[PDB]
């Protein structure tokens, strides 16, 4: 029954969508160790977001499924009878899921502890990680978009998916000929606005562009929005995430009765402070939780922030240089042969990352029997699942196929690079697969990937739901 499987994968990979593409395709039975299929299994290829497989596993080895993350507020000593302090410090230690509501709960504490006036300045301290915001080889033109957000120890995360280092922009039409109305979202009062957008007659054509020009903190909107259009929203990144955390904090403080009168900016706790009074603090959910929004939606910031967290754990240094050696070490300690690997970031954004399909599958079986196997597999998207927090980036793929509800896999797509790698649990054995595509001209070969994953589910003894 095994040559039929091979013949079919061989035919599927004949698709014209794979014209001039190197493809790495490996299938292995996790029970026996048997190699069911293998083509260019040792070719070194760009991973895109499949690299999070490696990061996620290392964060569980190094940090533990139990790990949470802290933020706090500090002044030189407690407030007194007048209710005054001098300077104040918001201090972040790598929480990738700090909401504006968390900032507000910490402002209430600062007030509930006797403060009524910050007489000096408010500072945002993100010194737990270094201030290298972007990887060397990320592309400048990409910097406005949430996947390319800058990297800090203190960052405010937006929405239920926890997109870090961004603000939501909204553009609402006026009457034909009047300017459009632009909201900066959270970055209101922080980011500059260059609004050049206009409202066009009803039913005309939407030509709206939302930008942050390279090396500014300006949201520039150009174009027309039709008078009858639905209002448009976009997530855009800001410069210096921690500075916006600070801005949002003084608003929170001001809202909870505390009256900040100095300015706002970056800076670390002075160190000529002996017994800093901590006036408020927050703790995130445990890393097993945080792994869900991270892995289902392929959050890049989470991945980088977990890398610099790993570098603090192994080496006292919140750095890529250090945390990437941390990831490589954790992978080794796990049983994975890392010869094929080049590690240049944790998210997969960087085109200086290299894996082989054999390596992915090694990790898959290694992470299969690890103590944390179930928390690791519960975070991988499941094929065909409607609910965004079960289906993730696979919710709209493979519905009504043998693979629906069954296949757990990580995705990842850029220009010229696409991958799908994960598990196929069945009666005919627990399978492990990795499809890595490099060099194609059209759209990503998502259908070729779905097609193989479905054949594998059929192989493992599955049928389409009807
Ligand atoms: C993972 O692959 C990650 N993707 C990206 O960051 C896309 C890279 C775009 C870069 C430009 N410069 C280009 O070259 O095209 C996340 N992955 C997914 C996913 O489906 O797995 C996303 C939905 C986007 S972010
Ligand atoms: Mg089924």
UniProtKB/Swiss-Prot annotation:
- InterPro entries cross-referenced by the UniProt entry: Beta-lactam/transpept-like, Peptidase_S13
Q: Which residues form the active site?
A: 49, 52, 298
The UniProt entry's GO biological process terms, in alphabetical order, are: cell wall organization; peptidoglycan biosynthetic process; proteolysis; regulation of cell shape; response to antibiotic
Please provide, alphabetically and separated by semicolons, the GO molecular function terms listed in this UniProt record.
serine-type D-Ala-D-Ala carboxypeptidase activity
* Domain of life, source organism: Bacteria
Q: Would you tell me the Gene Ontology cellular component terms?
A: extracellular region
Extract the SUPFAM superfamilies matched here: beta-lactamase/transpeptidase-like
UniProt subcellular location:
Secreted
Binding positions for substrate per the UniProt entry: 410
Which residues lie within the region annotated Absent in class-A beta-lactamases?
Answer: 97-270
Activity regulation, short description: Inhibited by benzylpenicillin, cephaloridine, ampicillin and cetiofur.
Q: What is its EC number?
A: 3.4.16.4
Q: What class of enzyme is it?
A: hydrolase
Q: Does the keyword Transcription apply?
A: no
Functional description taken from the UniProt entry? Removes C-terminal D-alanyl residues from sugar-peptide cell wall precursors.
Q: Can you tell me which family this protein belongs to? A: Belongs to the peptidase S13 family.
Q: What name is this protein filed under?
A: D-alanyl-D-alanine carboxypeptidase
This chain's source organism reads: Actinomadura sp. (strain R39)
